[PDB]
Design a protein around this ligand. Structure first.
Ligand code: FAD
Length: 329
């Protein structure tokens, strides 16, 4: 089954892009790597108030994503979750075939890359967990030390930032536990020796295996000794994950895209160098690019208009205004 447009990425930009595809009557598919939509907003700032979106004085990340899902839903596009698009090829008739890393074949006339700077992966940490506990008592760093006062804190990680975070948290937290899969740590050794001798509880060599929680938040983590294979359940009031991020374009590297600074070069029409392949949102590279949600909200529709022109040169330059759009009023 051949789609007119397949959008790679279901972040905020992919969602609005899908809506605009619907306005221009294109048969539309969105493909997202995570188990839920909303991209960096959903994973990294769902609880924060965004104030730099045109026309919206203040909105919580999560609420923006609900509103963008509502927009995306308008014309009922097909949403594909839990798939990393890694393969690209062209059929004889110009149809593009996208391959998911599990062999899944998707057929399309055009592609819009709304993939940001890559799949949103945290090293050795489950996407499902990242999505489920976002905005709760899951952190990827220490914003302010005072919020951790009196709390039982676990830090998973073995780098310098992990060891330093433990040392400045030890005076403030009810308790600090550091979980790491190797007995050796990063940073200056004085910081390690200090942590190791302080009341910080140092759990090595242990692997973080699982997060145990409810609707309110994470309540323990199950860890496994990397040698004996013995399981422990460690109590959690706050979990800080410091494993590092794995955010990159991966096998799209080998599609022959013109790439600059980890992003995909876009002309003013949001065209890449690959015919039928357009780009929008944080994925787009050009000099004056606005690396905001507001930027993506212009690039998306621009990309749809170019896709539409590419499928039919005699199409109107853009969709009708929403206020006089025949399917909306
Ligand atoms: C802490 C923080 C605060 C921020 N605050 C603001 C703010 O106040 N205002 C603002 O405008 N912006 C802010 N941003 C930036 C904002 O997050 C981005 O501009 C926005 O997320 C871009 O959306 P996007 O859809 O282009 O990319 P993303 O949100 O990165 O979404 C892209 C999606 O594509 C998926 N994906 C990637 N590759 C593939 C593939 N190959 N196959 C399938 N799926 C794939 C990814 O998993 C991801 O979910 C902030 C960012 C951070 C980290």
């Amino acid at each position: 089954e051949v789609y007119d447009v397949t959008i790679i990425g279901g972040g905020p930009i992919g969602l609005f892009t899908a809506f605009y595809c619907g306005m221009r009557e294109l048969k539309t598919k969105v493909i997202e790597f995570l188990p839920k939509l909303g991209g960096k907003v959903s994973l990294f700032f769902p609880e924060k108030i965004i104030r730099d979106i045109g026309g919206i004085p203040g909105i919580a990340g999560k609420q923006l994503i609900e509103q963008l899902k509502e927009q995306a839903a308008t014309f009922d596009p097909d949403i594909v979750l839990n798939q990393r698009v890694t393969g690209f090829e062209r059929l004889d008739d110009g149809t593009i075939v996208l391959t998911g890393s599990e062999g899944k074949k998707h057929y399309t006339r055009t592609v819009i890359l709304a993939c940001g700077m890559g799949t949103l992966e945290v090293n050795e940490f489950d996407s499902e967990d990242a999505a489920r506990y976002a905005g709760k008592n899951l952190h990827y760093g220490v914003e302010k030390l005072d919020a951790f006062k009196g709390k039982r804190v676990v830090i998973s990680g073995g780098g310098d930032t992990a060891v330093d975070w433990a040392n400045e948290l030890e005076p403030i937290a009810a308790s600090v536990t550091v979980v790491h899969r190797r007995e050796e740590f990063g940073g200056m050794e004085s910081s390690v020796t200090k942590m190791k001798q302080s009341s910080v509880r140092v759990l090595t060599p242990y692997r973080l295996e699982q997060l145990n929680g409810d609707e309110e938040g994470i309540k323990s983590v199950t860890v496994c000794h990397t040698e004996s294979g013995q399981r422990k359940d460690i109590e959690i009031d706050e979990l800080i994950i410091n494993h590092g991020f794995k955010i990159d374009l991966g096998p799209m590297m080998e599609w022959g895209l013109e790439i600059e600074e980890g992003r995909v070069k876009a002309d003013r029409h949001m065209r890449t160098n690959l015919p039928g392949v357009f780009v929008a949102g944080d994925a787009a590279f050009y000099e004056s690019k606005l690396r905001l949600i507001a930027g993506g909200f212009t690039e998306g529709p621009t990309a749809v208009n170019s896709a539409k022109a590419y499928l039919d040169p005699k199409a109107e330059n853009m969709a009708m205004y929403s206020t006089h759009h025949k399917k909306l009023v």
